[PDB]
Design a protein around this ligand. Sequence first.
Ligand SMILES: [Cl-]
Ligand SMILES: [Cl-]
Lengths: 477, 489
Amino acid sequence: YEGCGDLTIFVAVALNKVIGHKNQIPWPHITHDFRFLRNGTTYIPPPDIQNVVIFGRKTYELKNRINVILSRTVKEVPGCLVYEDLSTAIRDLRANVPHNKIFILGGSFLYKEVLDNGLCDKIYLTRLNKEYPGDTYFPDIPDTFEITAISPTFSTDFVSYDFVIYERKPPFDQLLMTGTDISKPKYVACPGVRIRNHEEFQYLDILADVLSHGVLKPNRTGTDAYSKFGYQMRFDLSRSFPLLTTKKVALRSIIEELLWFIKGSTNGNDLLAKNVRIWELNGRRDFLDKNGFTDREEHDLGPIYGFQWRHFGAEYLDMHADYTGKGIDQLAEIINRIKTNPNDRRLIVCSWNVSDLKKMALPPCHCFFQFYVSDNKLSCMMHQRSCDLGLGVPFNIASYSILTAMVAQVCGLGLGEFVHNLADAHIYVDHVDAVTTQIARIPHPFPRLRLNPDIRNIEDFTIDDIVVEDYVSHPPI
Amino acid sequence: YEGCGDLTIFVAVALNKVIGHKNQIPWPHITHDFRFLRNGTTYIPPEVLSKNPDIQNVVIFGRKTYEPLKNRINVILSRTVKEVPGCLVYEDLSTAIRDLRANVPHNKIFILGGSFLYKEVLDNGLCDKIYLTRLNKEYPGDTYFPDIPDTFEITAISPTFSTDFVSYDFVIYERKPPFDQLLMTGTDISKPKYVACPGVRIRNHEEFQYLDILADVLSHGVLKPNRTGTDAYSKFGYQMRFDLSRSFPLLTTKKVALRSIIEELLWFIKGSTNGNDLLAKNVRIWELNGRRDFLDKNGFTDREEHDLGPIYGFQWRHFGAEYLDMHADYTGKGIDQLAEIINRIKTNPNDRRLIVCSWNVSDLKKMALPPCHCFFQFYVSDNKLSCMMHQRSCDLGLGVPFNIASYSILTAMVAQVCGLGLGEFVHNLADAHIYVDHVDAVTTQIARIPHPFPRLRLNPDIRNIEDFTIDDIVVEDYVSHPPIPMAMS
Ligand SMILES: [Cl-]
Ligand SMILES: [Cl-]
């Protein structure tokens, strides 16, 4: 295979490695993916030259490109060049047919032959987060390749997906003009990935930033933490559901917790009854008496989140009390105001009720969020005063992404962005090794969120009405 | 001068253009400036370094310039000394360069001064690049750097730095994308309508954060109505940060009324809700919103003129108190958040709950305006105080520059009283907008090249935050472009 190196693959691959079913594409058409494949395969560095596109006899369909077929069962096709061998086809085109670049568009045998003889330098692979029935498969990529580029996660009504590139294996004034010493972070997330458009990299980079540059200082828990202050992350909720994929995150507890905030409950038995334990330790006899709540029942958590959302300013008594018509129903008012005046700049739910702090088991961590409406899409921004990057923050991202999607449905709006402000972002010293493993993992396409579309009031959502589809993740750490 | 082009200048220059005084540096030494000059004049590209291991840069001066500059070929121009301890000497510049390039293997030639040498280099177009340390203070002197020809523009700006006695930055003046990066966005493969200072390619001045946001909102913001009747271009979610140990971020691209910012802050701190307290000091920030017509239109029909309700100050000092009117005595009532958080910082700086919140949901309806700067959080690490503030509604043209300054002063005040050094101010913008009638103003502003930021000096004797007065809060070395008129809508 002399002179047949540097061939580029384009392919779309399901989660179970299927690329074809009965000579057809095993999934419903992804228009986006064909826009992508076209754009990549027609690009000419900046007169009438074209790129070459090669496929096997099976691949049953291309404009503005040279088409080359590999068959031993046909030598004539309308419009196409035909060859019996890959060896023969590459040598011939590169000597006698003037072109820019050669792409390989498929048949498993074409891909296996291209891969087995080390003839491919680059693979543009559309990753689909779903298994599809099939009979034709993309061969395993040899350990000789790594992913160097990742796009944002996208989605259709039936799958989430992205594009990757696999490949084989700074001017002085930019340093001088910082004003600081001219002469490398101890930790870098996925150093091999050079084009880093997956939203999850926002999170990996922050982990890496805190471990590299955070100050080791103490805190209320006893265990110390590396800490740094001030970050902002954004997630496009029209596109994907930002549930982290570099480790497995379970959401059942997060969703029950959100629903419980929405019901305005301060009763921790409501969660335990569903075997949700997030809040258990903070409702126990020990923790309560230690924090001065001698006179309160176990699992009475005080006027925390849910109380503030539905009853801000009401006098708290106990978790059994009736607070209907008491205090200000922030959540209800703000949903109403979104429907009635989407341009309002005060679409805020504040849990940081300063008067009620002394009565709370834990003062709120996600203290404050604000909605925004622009072109019929709902955005949300949330302030998080204390941010556990090891264990906490990933649940918080999902929670407020789900809430925003919930509020958008009931208000008849599309989805914009969740913007998450982190104040004291920290990694506890015990988690340094878990995190080091995490930032080394290449992220999968994010999942999608599907809400029951019949639900028209925020109070009517239940756990079955909130489904995350197509969640592929690395193992739990 | 055949073959005598691309000479590179390094120079340090006062606001009045003085580079020398009695053969001495006019200002107290800036060691940072020497390290900068050193690093710039001794740098060899690794390409060249590997193919010539011992190669050095050349550095030229006239006899006058009185310190050999290690790791460089020191060249010295004179007509009155034929040899110097370990240097090359020449009658004139012309021959120096010709000889150096013909017969003395070197990497790059730098011109380190004498006015006449700078003058000769500029006049004859021999220089392609100037590395200039800008000082925001005039100093007495007798040697000046020549005016820089209109043929040069600034292409790089460092962060603003400061010493005990001046603020300064570094700039570069100069004469005059891979396909996978585009494909892998997943979106269109093929320019924003507005770009701030497009000639500046290295953009480390912090003010660029604010200038880039102005351009972003103009380029991509959505025009939307609001409660003022004047519409605005609007976009959601930004974050800016300012290093308050290096400089005070008073915007330089327009003249900002510092005095009005300070009086307003002191007014918040005292917990006052009487707009007359500001008017009595000819500060008019709040006048429109305490007016009869505006109070009545928003239902505050039995309220006294310029009684603004339980806004900011009241919330900082008396959160949860019952508001009666602006004359009522509230001492002891409500929760004194400012006092308590100040106390928490001293007692336990690693507390993760150092929050002052003005967004009192129970009091929103009694307010003239619900607060725009809702909520701020303090943070300590390495004995440095940082602050993060959430602004729900951000008037980019008029309000935001005041906010940045206001909270930077506050963080400095709180730092001083807690015995802390200075960290960062971190500004979170939610609804960031440009009103339609500020569009020309801002387009003017974003083309202007930032000056180095000023410095903040607090009276060190003040130990309680309530004892600060305007004389105690000084901003030094403020250089700015002219003011830009903008209507309050
Ligand atoms: Cl407003
Ligand atoms: Cl905490």
